[PDB]
Amino acid sequence: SRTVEDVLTPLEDCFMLDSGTVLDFSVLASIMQSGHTRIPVYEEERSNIVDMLYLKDLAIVEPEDCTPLSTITRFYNHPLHFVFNDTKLDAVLEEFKRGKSHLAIVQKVNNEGEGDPFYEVLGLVTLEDVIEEIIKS
Amino acid sequence: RTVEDVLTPLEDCFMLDSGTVLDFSVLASIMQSGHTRIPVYEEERSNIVDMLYLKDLAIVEPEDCTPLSTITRFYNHPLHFVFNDTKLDAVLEEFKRGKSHLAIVQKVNNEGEGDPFYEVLGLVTLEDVIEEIIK
Amino acid sequence: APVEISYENMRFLITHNPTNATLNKFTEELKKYGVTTLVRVCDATYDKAPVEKEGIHVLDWPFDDGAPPPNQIVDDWLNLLKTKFREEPGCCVAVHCVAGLGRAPVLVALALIECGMKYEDAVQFIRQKRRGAFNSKQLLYLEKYRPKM
Amino acid sequence: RPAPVEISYENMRFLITHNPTNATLNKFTEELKKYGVTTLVRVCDATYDKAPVEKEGIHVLDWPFDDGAPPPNQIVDDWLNLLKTKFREEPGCCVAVHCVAGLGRAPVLVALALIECGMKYEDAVQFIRQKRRGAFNSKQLLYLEKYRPKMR
């Protein structure tokens, strides 16, 4: 019935940081002021997501001196998890339980183009949201 | 399944005392935990008065050393009480009706010739509830 | 966080006690609900004058932990309500004991039954509002309570 | 997609991959070696030094065609001849392909082999997308339907 597309957060509305972010006070403040558990990292197009920042990542920084982002993401080298736009909610629910992670990034395929197909990235969906859509009403 | 199985019992919870100073090493200790939600007790641990969110700490710096007890009076975050016997779906409603994705866990007490009370058992968050739903 | 109990012309706050630190926001919270009278049964610790100045008549009416009300406290309670709802139609009566689930609601449940609520229904109504209410002792007194009045 | 895809069918066997960097070159080569590939065919992203691959036994062929473009007949002929020998001469073994994300002209070439090995055109297309969701646009589907096999 319902696909990921319905539970999705669209891309503009996702809190993301670029890969050459520097983690001074005011960025760290913005990160906390988001209060996401899991902030994705793009380069330098947004649709292009390279790595995943967990919260406990920043825990083992201080904002000395300013310490750069792209280091931290290399450190733990957190795996990142892809799901297709048209995957059904119960099926994506399976993928999360196979995961450690409770957040997917969402591709559809692109058939428009004379080119080779490619994976368009549409945005984000969290486990939270998926359950929050099986309370349903 | 009730809250009780999914509950973190109190001893094992990270919390902070109400006259915490937020110095460097305290603010770090908050961070190195990495909860989104940290409870504030006075001075018996079972007694919980207020509720540090993360975005609270964003808008302090460890100047001078800044009192915790102020910050909590600032935003005045409501704290959410749940019963032990609340079944997991029923709990999940309360997170959805709330802003909050943590509740503190009350068991009743008719043991004793006294008035009743709520005993405080521990803590249950959204994440735990889902982390049980998968299992 | 405190509890309204409406039934007909009657209106009750069950509250927690303040500190002196919280006293203003406590009194403002009382005023929000539009109370004319507190009863303290327990936690009789804080300056009552700042509450009584704002309009709110404070009675320390203390009795025992886990106990039914002494008959004299009943009659004062009954008389207090009987006038104060008649004299000021609309208004609320505040009570606190120690977490608001023993003897404080007993006084309320008392009132409900006297207002011709069935014993069981009075009880359930309170427990709906605040779960955990009454020990076995107090439930009994409630059951054994015959209204007149 | 950096995870590569095996496609088996009879004595034929195909790894579709991503291209590496040089930063990844060893692990890429080790990964090819794992699958037991004897030959890479690079269709795109011919970006990296190939000798460290060929030194490890794996023949690297730059057979580029353009994005959107079908396989040029000479590439078709060379691909087909490569497999026909390579599957006979070393039974077991794999051929690697890569172009860009491996759902366009690379799996075309795989499909082409399958059809020549007597797969129904439609069946090949599905069999691929099975292992690689999103494979083939319209034009390549048109190509594949219009492809008439004879050979080996």
Side-chain angles (χ1 to χ4, degrees), chain A residues 1-55 57-63 65-96 99-137, chain B residues 2-60 62-95 98-106 108-134, chain C residues 1-46 48-147, chain D residues 2-149 151:
Chain A
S1 41
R2 300 290 275 210
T3 61
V4 162
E5 280 230 66
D6 314 312
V7 204
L8 165 135
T9 328
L11 222 231
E12 339 105 292
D13 288 299
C14 308
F15 190 86
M16 346 220 277
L17 311 151
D18 114 88
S19 62
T21 311
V22 223
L23 314 158
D24 57 78
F25 272 109
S26 60
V27 182
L28 270 144
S30 167
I31 280 145
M32 274 151 180
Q33 219 251 212
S34 84
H36 296 70
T37 43
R38 249 101 141 149
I39 303 129
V41 166
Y42 67 90
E43 182 210 311
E44 211 49 66
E45 216 140 19
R46 262 176 78 91
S47 336
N48 191 89
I49 295 156
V50 190
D51 266 283
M52 200 65 226
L53 179 94
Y54 298 7
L55 182 69
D57 298 9
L58 312 115
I60 301 135
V61 100
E62 52 193 275
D65 281 284
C66 321
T67 358
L69 189 262
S70 50
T71 45
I72 312 259
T73 56
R74 214 135 69 254
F75 289 6
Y76 313 92
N77 210 44
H78 283 313
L80 85 171
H81 287 104
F82 290 73
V83 87
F84 285 92
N85 78 291
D86 65 342
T87 322
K88 218 270 214 79
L89 262 73
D90 43 61
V92 67
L93 208 70
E94 306 312 301
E95 175 77 46
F96 279 130
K100 190 245 142 150
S101 92
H102 42 243
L103 164 58
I105 99 122
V106 182
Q107 332 141 296
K108 82 147 152 234
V109 306
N110 210 115
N111 274 344
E112 158 72 80
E114 305 287 280
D116 292 9
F118 60 106
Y119 296 146
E120 198 149 270
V121 164
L122 276 160
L124 293 176
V125 64
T126 140
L127 227 187
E128 220 215 315
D129 295 357
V130 180
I131 318 286
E132 213 104 45
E133 187 70 14
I134 302 157
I135 33 148
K136 328 100 142 81
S137 98
Chain B
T2 61
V3 168
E4 254 214 71
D5 320 288
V6 195
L7 160 129
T8 331
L10 259 183
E11 334 105 307
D12 281 277
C13 308
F14 188 76
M15 9 215 247
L16 300 161
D17 117 87
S18 59
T20 302
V21 246
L22 319 145
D23 52 75
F24 273 105
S25 57
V26 168
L27 260 138
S29 184
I30 299 143
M31 274 162 219
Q32 217 232 250
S33 77
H35 303 70
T36 43
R37 254 88 169 149
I38 296 103
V40 176
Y41 66 80
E42 190 199 292
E43 212 51 69
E44 195 158 29
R45 265 173 75 94
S46 10
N47 186 87
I48 290 140
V49 235
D50 268 280
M51 200 60 227
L52 196 72
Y53 295 3
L54 229 208
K55 54 240 93 193
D56 307 10
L57 300 125
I59 322 164
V60 90
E63 302 87 271
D64 256 55
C65 306
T66 358
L68 189 271
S69 47
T70 41
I71 321 269
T72 58
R73 215 136 74 237
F74 289 11
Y75 311 93
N76 214 40
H77 293 314
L79 67 180
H80 276 91
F81 301 90
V82 96
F83 296 107
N84 86 288
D85 80 325
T86 328
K87 236 249 238 127
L88 254 76
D89 48 75
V91 199
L92 209 50
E93 325 295 278
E94 174 69 32
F95 293 141
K99 200 249 166 99
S100 74
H101 48 230
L102 161 73
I104 97 110
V105 187
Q106 280 170 340
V108 264
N109 216 110
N110 310 304
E111 160 59 48
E113 310 278 66
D115 282 17
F117 51 95
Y118 314 122
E119 204 147 58
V120 173
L121 269 182
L123 288 173
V124 71
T125 131
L126 227 184
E127 238 222 292
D128 306 349
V129 174
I130 314 299
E131 216 91 48
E132 193 70 35
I133 289 154
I134 62 111
Chain C
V3 208
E4 199 145 358
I5 293 103
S6 314
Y7 183 84
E8 311 188 328
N9 57 277
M10 302 203 298
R11 223 162 62 92
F12 308 97
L13 206 79
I14 289 162
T15 338
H16 233 274
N17 72 99
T19 43
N20 297 279
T22 40
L23 235 169
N24 250 24
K25 278 108 217 218
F26 177 73
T27 326
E28 273 132 30
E29 198 184 46
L30 288 169
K31 281 190 134 178
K32 195 246 178 257
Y33 286 95
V35 296
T36 58
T37 295
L38 232 169
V39 190
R40 297 146 110 213
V41 199
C42 326
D43 323 324
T45 51
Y46 60 94
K48 54 115 102 142
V51 205
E52 292 206 308
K53 261 162 193 182
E54 295 298 285
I56 307 125
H57 181 43
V58 171
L59 307 133
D60 288 297
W61 282 358
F63 65 93
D64 261 2
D65 191 36
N71 258 311
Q72 199 224 102
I73 318 188
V74 179
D75 274 298
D76 303 355
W77 176 247
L78 286 194
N79 214 242
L80 175 85
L81 320 160
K82 222 224 154 187
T83 61
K84 227 85 170 72
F85 296 138
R86 264 238 28 85
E87 168 198 66
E88 302 153 301
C91 78
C92 188
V93 186
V95 225
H96 65 81
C97 194
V98 68
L101 71 204
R103 48 211 132 134
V106 177
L107 249 50
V108 193
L110 218 63
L112 316 171
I113 292 152
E114 210 64 67
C115 210
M117 214 164 187
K118 290 259 101 71
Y119 145 72
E120 295 105 290
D121 288 82
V123 171
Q124 201 223 20
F125 188 32
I126 306 274
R127 292 194 137 150
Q128 175 225 304
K129 290 274 175 120
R130 210 89 176 277
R131 218 182 100 181
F134 323 108
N135 62 27
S136 120
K137 230 170 120 114
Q138 282 154 0
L139 264 161
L140 231 160
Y141 167 73
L142 251 40
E143 191 173 39
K144 290 226 309 118
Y145 196 73
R146 24 169 283 272
Chain D
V5 173
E6 199 164 359
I7 293 116
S8 312
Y9 185 80
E10 325 202 327
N11 57 281
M12 317 192 309
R13 210 160 64 81
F14 300 101
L15 192 78
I16 299 183
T17 345
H18 233 270
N19 71 104
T21 43
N22 301 270
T24 41
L25 234 197
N26 267 6
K27 280 102 210 282
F28 175 72
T29 321
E30 255 154 80
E31 183 174 53
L32 298 184
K33 260 176 151 220
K34 186 232 163 280
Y35 281 88
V37 336
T38 51
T39 293
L40 225 183
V41 183
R42 285 144 120 218
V43 190
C44 313
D45 329 312
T47 48
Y48 55 102
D49 193 6
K50 62 140 105 101
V53 183
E54 310 204 302
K55 280 151 177 255
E56 297 305 304
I58 297 150
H59 191 21
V60 167
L61 293 125
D62 298 306
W63 284 346
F65 49 113
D66 288 318
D67 201 5
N73 257 309
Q74 219 233 118
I75 298 202
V76 170
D77 285 332
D78 284 2
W79 178 248
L80 267 193
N81 203 232
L82 174 51
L83 316 157
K84 198 218 170 129
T85 64
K86 240 36 173 73
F87 294 135
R88 259 218 56 78
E89 160 205 84
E90 313 164 51
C93 76
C94 210
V95 177
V97 238
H98 71 68
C99 179
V100 44
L103 44 234
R105 49 222 139 124
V108 160
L109 232 42
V110 187
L112 230 41
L114 295 171
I115 291 154
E116 218 58 63
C117 209
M119 206 128 187
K120 289 241 122 90
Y121 133 72
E122 295 100 308
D123 273 297
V125 166
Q126 186 197 21
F127 184 33
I128 301 301
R129 303 173 140 191
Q130 211 194 303
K131 292 263 190 102
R132 203 85 236 257
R133 222 196 110 163
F136 322 117
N137 75 26
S138 38
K139 203 205 196 78
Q140 306 167 297
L141 293 188
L142 228 188
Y143 177 71
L144 254 34
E145 189 192 52
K146 289 250 253 135
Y147 190 81
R148 39 180 281 276
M151 51 266 259

